RNA sequence: UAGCGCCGGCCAACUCCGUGCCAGCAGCCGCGGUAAUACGGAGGGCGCGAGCGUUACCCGGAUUCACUGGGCGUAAAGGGCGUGUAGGCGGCCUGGGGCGUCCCAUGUGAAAGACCACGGCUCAACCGUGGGGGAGCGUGGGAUACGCUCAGGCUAGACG
RNA sequence: CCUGGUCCACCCGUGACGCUGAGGCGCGAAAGCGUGGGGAGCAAACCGGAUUAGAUACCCGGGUAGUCCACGCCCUAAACGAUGCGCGCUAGGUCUCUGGGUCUCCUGGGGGCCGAAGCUAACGCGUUAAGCGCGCCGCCUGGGGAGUACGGCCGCAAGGC
């Protein structure tokens, strides 16, 4: 009963750097793993791997975060600071190769779905494609 | 040093009581009872010892602070005994943090020493004089193990480290490295260098307070006898 | 939520009220919400009047 | 229309030294020499701590004060200073140099910006050319200023030329001196003019 | 050689017994313009001694900002208690565009061209630490591929 | 030929006299009660300049209708509660189509304006030549991840 | 006696049949209204006694509608958790209800309490979110004028929307 798994993994994500787990277990889907093919490539997690529950496919997701600290909150940056969904079910947002945008002064990453596969901002200059900009992460 | 010795009595402490990040330091819990993972220790415990060796053979202070009565005095012992600073009273509030505004009474009562034997008294008004030894015997209590430091510590000692939370947040804050003996009844991540064991019971205490004190005293050179228990 | 503390003094007034030998049992607030406090509170120590003695 | 004025009475609420009055100025007469405080009876009272509004107000209107212009065209001096390519502190002061009534006392041809504007208007002046009267003309780089063939030999002209005589000018200047010539060569870097002026404050201001 | 601009000064108040009692209290940027700024709010029963303790908290309170250019590296919106600070980093004619709060800190941050805008309450002692904790999270390309 | 506005705070520029809740100023907060930098005059200063101010209307500051970019426990804001029509939204896996959607090509997007550069009126306003755009739509070509549709299977939703 | 909801356990069946929901429809405390019953206690209105400067009140002795039943209207509220519904993800501690189990405990669903992280203008919230996300609906946009007027719709009226 989840009306996007998409926006749900990244919060399932989200929820738990916040706390620093070891992993966390998403439910596994094709598009899913695809694009975790990007966070994990670009160095926003370890990575990610084919586990089970119950017979149910899920995606064990192992979360960079980053060195201790001295002085009050010992506790450390994230990788992932920043993660938000963009094109939502409510409204599918859509852009061309020049309308494509870059996040945080190429800082960070825009991933975005399209027909030549899950590819980055970088990527789709790279390549000249547009496509639905699945969100935005640093 | 001592490796599974540590099981004497120095093992697992408390029942639901437990701050849930300590979790991966226990092993389980019986008797109805959370009790710590002791390889658990050594591992960390190995970790922990190299940083006070290498702060010794630096040749720099260390603050030494328990104040519940199941760790208080055997806390005196091993910080005479070690030649370092301790705290057996209430904790003052700023005692690292407001330092300076402390300090004025620290000389406050080393003005009481050369005035202890001085000809100034006696040519004093007989309570003048007990005022004086009652501020001493004041400032004594509180202040026995402090004046041992004039100058910010380098780490420091606690043994229960959410008792003495005051205490680990100075520290805490200054920048200052805190050693310190957590359980069951306490959290990691708000300590660097953590003994994983007992904070009550004075065997778990004893272990690690004379024996990493014996491993400071021969680090800055020189090895001796057990310490008094 | 710092109201508690009206709780926490009408459930105490209850809770001593209650051990006594004898108590009153008619003896509350007009409010409401102190008044579940004192007499569920002099129920407490009226029923460990019961248990132990 | 231009200033028009007591000159060496805003020499002073500036605080710092306008050289607008050439000669004088340059003697112990400037009043920054003699009554460094501002004008009106409130120069002699202690000063009261500036408004971030009235610290770049005074910037600017240092800058602006010094060559005379209309705060109507030195505003279109900005502008399209930032709508121009390029760092806009530099191109404006840059294009705020190449007006030629400026570039005419950059030559060296008359102690004052005044005085400049006088001698352009009055066409004695000329460029690469025909005779210009016009004190706002842009000087183009690599542009000849001469003066007039018909001005040649001129009492005001001359001695002003014999102050000239030897003393050197400008990176972005070149001289041939009693050959009454000389040349716009290089666009102004910002370093070669040297003002008590932050072109910061200017820019700020115009924000608002 | 620390620059130490004032921005925030104002006369509280608390009530006493026939009568009422003042404290002032003042805020206080300070700076090099080298990239080492910090703030802090002195307060305190007279007009100086307030202004005064504004230099010293501020003196020990600090921060890395890593000039670009002598900008900034990346564009950020912060929040800090209902009042909200948005840095676009700005090209070298730009100039300082903020409010007399932000430029001022970014004055003595040394930062030479910016696009500010500030959103939510403007309450400047509310806009001051928004803007700290706002230079305070800045990362540079290097802090970045690091941790990744 | 030099003029007009301001000089309590916002907001740049201060003193004397007159007046005494009067005469008056005013965009908001407010000012005038005998020592008024807030009224009227002067002296002085600030601003701009053949203009300076005012009224009216439009955008801005208004992030105060919030797509970008707001909210609703008590500040204004959850329907008294259900049931359900339309509509909006749609879990895993595989394939057929290609509507959305994405790229390429080609047509159109008049000129003037605008932008960049270069020039012609002594400059400028003003004008000329040249350059490059641009969503948008028509046509041909392609791509299939995501939404869509058709088809086949699944058990984590849901029901039994 | 007739009947709804809801929880557990088995993993048996169906195979996305789902969530929400403008209008619509039904329900909707008390008071009030229509018809016919009923009427002990209580009690608007009302009558007395007091108190009071007065006392169209507070207190006292009375007392009618009403309060009760049937049927039909009315459709409001501090109709309140002043918190729309559905799903997912994010420390635990505690006592209580009710299921199930290899029964100290473990585990599913309700009810409260203190609280990690986080939220918040603060108060406070916090696995029963006011957290972190997604879907949909509903409402807000300075105070008074005013929930007034006009129109419309509804009601026997009161009056509602
Ligand atoms: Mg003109
Ligand atoms: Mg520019
Ligand atoms: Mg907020
Ligand atoms: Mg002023
Ligand atoms: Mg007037
Ligand atoms: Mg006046
Ligand atoms: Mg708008
Ligand atoms: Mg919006
Ligand atoms: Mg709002
Ligand atoms: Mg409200
Ligand atoms: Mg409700
Ligand atoms: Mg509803
Ligand atoms: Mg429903
Ligand atoms: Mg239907
Ligand atoms: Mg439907
Ligand atoms: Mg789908
Ligand atoms: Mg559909
Ligand atoms: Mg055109
Ligand atoms: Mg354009
Ligand atoms: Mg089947
Ligand atoms: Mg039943
Ligand atoms: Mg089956
Ligand atoms: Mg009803
Ligand atoms: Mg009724
Ligand atoms: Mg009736
Ligand atoms: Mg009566
Ligand atoms: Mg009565
Ligand atoms: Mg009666
Ligand atoms: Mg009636
Ligand atoms: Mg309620
Ligand atoms: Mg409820
Ligand atoms: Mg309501
Ligand atoms: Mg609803
Ligand atoms: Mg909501
Ligand atoms: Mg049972
Ligand atoms: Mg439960
Ligand atoms: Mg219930
Ligand atoms: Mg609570
Ligand atoms: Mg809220
Ligand atoms: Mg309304
Ligand atoms: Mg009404
Ligand atoms: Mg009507
Ligand atoms: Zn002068």
Redesign the pocket.
Known sequence: ?????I??M???I???T??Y?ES?DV??????E?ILRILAREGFIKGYERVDV????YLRVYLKYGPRRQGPDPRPEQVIHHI??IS?????V??????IPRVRRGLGIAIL??????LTDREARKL?????LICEVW | VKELLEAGVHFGHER?R???KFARYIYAERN?IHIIDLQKTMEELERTFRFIEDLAMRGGTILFVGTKKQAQDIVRMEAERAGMPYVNQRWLGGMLTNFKTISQRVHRLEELEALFASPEIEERPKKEQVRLKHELERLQKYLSGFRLLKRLPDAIFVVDPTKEAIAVREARKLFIPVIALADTDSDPDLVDYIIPGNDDAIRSIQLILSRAVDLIIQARGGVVEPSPS | ??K?DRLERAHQRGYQAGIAGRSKEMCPYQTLNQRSQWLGGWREAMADRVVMA | ???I?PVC??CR?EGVKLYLKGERCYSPKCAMERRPY?????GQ?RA?R??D??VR??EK?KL?RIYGI???QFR?LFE?AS???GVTGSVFLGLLESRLDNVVYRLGFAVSRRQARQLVRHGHITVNG?????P???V?PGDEIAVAEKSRNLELIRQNLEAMKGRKVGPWLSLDVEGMKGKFLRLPDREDLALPVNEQLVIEFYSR | DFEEKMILIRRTARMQAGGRRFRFGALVVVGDRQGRVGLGFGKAPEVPLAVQKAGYYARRNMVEVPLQNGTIPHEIEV?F??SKIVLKPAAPGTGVIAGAVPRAILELAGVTDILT?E?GSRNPINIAYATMEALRQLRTKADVERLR
């Open positions: 009963m989840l009306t996007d798994p926006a749900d990244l919060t399932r989200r929820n738990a916040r706390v787990k966390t439910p596994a889907s094709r598009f899913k695809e119950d017979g149910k496919p938000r969904r939502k079910p409510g409204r599918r859509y852009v061309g190769v020049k309308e779905s399209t027909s030549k596969g899950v000249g494609v547009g496509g639905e | 639901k437990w701050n849930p109805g | 939520r710092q508690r | 229309g231009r200033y004025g009475r805003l609420r501002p004008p009106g009876q409130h009272k009261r500036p408004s509004y009235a107000l005074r209107q602006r209309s705060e109507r279109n399209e709508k121009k390519k025909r005779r210009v009267d016009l706002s003309y842009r183009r | 929040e208690g209902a805008k959103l």
